[model samples]
Target: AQLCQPDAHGVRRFNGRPCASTTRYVDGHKGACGCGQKGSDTPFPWNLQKHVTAPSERYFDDGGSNLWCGKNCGKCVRLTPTGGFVPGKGGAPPNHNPVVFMVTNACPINGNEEWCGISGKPGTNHVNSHGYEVHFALQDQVGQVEALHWDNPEVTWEEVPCPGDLQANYQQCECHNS
Candidate 1:
């Protein structure tokens, strides 16, 4: 079935159904996915150690902590922001780099909030301020959207333990369970 695009209402065809939430506060905000229902069965502290492939090649969002993991695997609840995660209050911080990643982990920690994400990736860069620019239709499409690292050296891609000590940033990386 054809699906409507994401909006103030919610994301379409999320986990094979519509996301129930309307309070999309920010990218890392708890209700950001807009799948507001409860007990979504989206595994707590989702494993991003290995990127999951999309159902089809035609689908965007090739990998990385999928917004939709299928089988009702979309998160139903909002994640608690912590450990340097700054929620976007409808606008980005002045002087803050437009492109940044906020990776969250609900990993069990003693005496700590279960949901938390760290935000910050300074090296490398993009030419456009926007990211993952989506198109409504081929007719709505414009010229190719682009990102550039400028004249900087090629960024490293490597494998490491997921959420290892220091919680090091891993771009284009893979991880295995200990």
Candidate 2:
């Protein structure tokens, strides 16, 4: 769920060093793409925008590799909720508002079985229990926004170019396709 895991001292590390050692931690979250690292070529908002961790099959460069710096990393998606809102949760009506989110990390298959493990055939997309082809594990901060207040909101999604001010950070890793 998190890009970097905290060690014994409760310090988050990317490849054994402090995550901030590579780049300053923005709001306590760092992405697997290392896109926010100092001197990165395709730098953008690994922290500034509302980001999501995509399903593993959709996140990895080679569908199931579980590798970091996946093809979806840094890519943007537009999501419009379809319906099925929970009464207590605060959210806008279906299709009332759409939000753009960038892929900053991966939702691993091991622990997140229902949410991120399953997918369609290698090249195709299929819906999960929530009736969506992909799962966008929204960052905690995103939930505070009224448009995305449900526990499990069903949404229609599509890949869109990263916003003008937020370019994709593919240059941080070789696994990505520019």
Candidate 3:
């Protein structure tokens, strides 16, 4: 599938911005994978730690990025916390139990290079500065935030088909469809 193209500056844009407006708001919350809002889809706080994983910017759907949404949007990934945290922003250890997260957003290439800058081509393995193979940006919801207090918690991830019950309202993307 074709992926979103980056401009000369190497910044990926959708609808002339880093993300499309439809992807930016889902029932008033932020999402970037173009996964639309559906009544049957799992809602906010409940979906945070349970079914959401915003991958690092480089790993997001930018050309060769592994988590490219051309075929990965609305897909799922099983994550097992690897028992560590991003440096400096220390907090409680992550829950060891494995969890499945749906791909609904991308962690933009902001100032946090340690977590978002480092990545490898699709179907390859690489680690960020924190030694994390993939950074799962757990949604920051009310009750969910405090539960996993660590920032950029380490996790070993594997692609998995989305569960039957957890479905996304997939939106149209010119980049992927064309």
Candidate 4:
């Protein structure tokens, strides 16, 4: 079941399942707390749903420790029980202006013939239990108004020789939890 959550911009972020914060109902009450002043229902949108879920994108990176997406991505990943994103701290600005680092478990082996994604969670992208994930920041520059403008426009998908252990224990990689 794809549960929907509204983000900072009111954009609904869907989750594969019900997140940890799903507000539950009381056993006896059909509605919420049942604070009937003179025998009235809790009120509109105020009973349980409102108290249980707080809308925000930060929920994506709420529960997990900081980690890099590692390899060709050169970006960070942080995960909450609900979602993930490129973190602001650890040298990343609030957001990468030209290219906002985002979720991408699309290609495996990142920059080469090899193939792999977030450890056992292959074909998945979100921050958490994760490190320096890299991708083609300058690949085939399609120069547009939003292109990352630097002095020398160069691009390369350098295969990162990440430590084997780092690759194996990705959720707790060294680059993360620092």
Candidate 5:
């Protein structure tokens, strides 16, 4: 039930629940107008399923702001809804390379505990550039590569110290870190 929205800072922030912009019927019909991040509005790819639900390897910051994902640069709506990324050996996800930025309104907390895959998992040799180089891909319900969400793979995560099933938190600044 995650939502695709933007923070007050115009940054992406994937809430684990449906936001004002999230709707299941974003396909046919008049389309889910609840979200301003229309599939054609901002032009960013937000992996709502992998950001806070399932598990993933390609992640940005350490692991605090696991709530957010990367997103393309453009017009975004909703308070915290966003787009994320997934980079492989060849280069970022999706067909095109959009300069996507991390969806954190603040800084980071975890030093270097990359998100190897899923929660509690740590990455090996990698650097996320504090969202400064984080990119993501837009996928359909079937989770297939659809289009380019953004054009940049840079930005960082924030520590949103909160309580959740997996202990929630998102950075706001390196010093204000949790």
Candidate 6:
């Protein structure tokens, strides 16, 4: 079957089936992949993108410095907005730049919120001036959208271990599962 271009839906044919969502929201949007995703949109279902092995050569995403890794393999989700990472023989190798990643509990209701769930004082970066930018078509097409980091309003994150010994803003908070 001749599939429609991403401008219309961007879904591909699988066994000659329709294999796509009918949401009109994917049209005319920028920065979204042809499969229909946004830079800040979320509800990432692929939580193992940080640890999963690549499915194919098609999964590779360049790290801007010739460093390459797959989008579905958990590298992007590890980024802390630093645009870079240290070297390691670990799973991700080292992208030298971190990108926003995908991991969500749902398929995202839409771009109605912004900012990641946080524990202590939130970062003062000033976001959500226009609410979150969504990419529903990726959800519609791939049906594998993960949780978006920027899709939270008054959302809170509880880092477990309990504050060790800061006695300040660093207090009342736990480390990463230690």
lDDT (C-alpha) at residue 147 in model 1 = 24
Better of 1 and 6 by TM-score: 1
**Candidate 4 lDDT, tens digit per residue, 1-178?**
2123434433224343212111111222212112122244322222222111111122212222222222222222222222222233112123323222222112323232211122222123321121212221111112321232221111111123433432332322222322
Residues 119-147 of candidate 3 have per-residue lDDT tens digits of: 56233444455434345566655435345
Model 1 Cα shift for residue 16 (angstroms) = 35
Stretches off by above 4 angstroms in model 4 are 1-105, 110-117, 122-130, 133-141, 144-146, 150-178
Per-prediction TM-score: 0.18, 0.59, 0.59, 0.18, 0.20, 0.17
- Candidates 3 and 6 compared by TM-score, better number: 3
lDDT digits (tens) for residues 1-178 of candidate 2: 2333445545333455222110011234455555556444443444434444444455444455544666666677775554433234223343537666666666666666655554542235343333233456665543343334444454455578877544644444343454
Candidates by TM-score, descending order: 2, 3, 5, 1, 4, 6
- After TM-score superposition, what is the CA distance of residue 105 in candidate 4 from its true location, in Å? 9.3
lDDT of 4: 0.23
Q: Which has the better lDDT: candidate 1, or candidate 6?
A: 6
lDDT of each: 0.19, 0.48, 0.47, 0.23, 0.25, 0.20
Error of 2 at 126 (Å): 4.6
Question: Candidate 1's residue-wise lDDT over 1-178, tens digit each?
Answer: 1122233323222223221101111122221122223344332222222121111111112223234322212211211111111123122212222221122222111221111111111111111111101111000011111121111111111122343322332221122110
Candidate 5 residue lDDT tens string, 59-170: 3223444333322111121212233333432222243232212222212223223322223113232223321112222223333322333222222333242333212222
Root-mean-square deviation of Cα positions for candidate 5 versus the true structure, in angstroms: 16.4
Which candidate tops lDDT? 2
How many clashing pairs per prediction, in order?
A: 3, 0, 0, 28, 43, 23
> Once model 6 is optimally superposed onto the true structure by TM-score, how far is the C-alpha of residue 128 displaced, in angstroms?
3.7
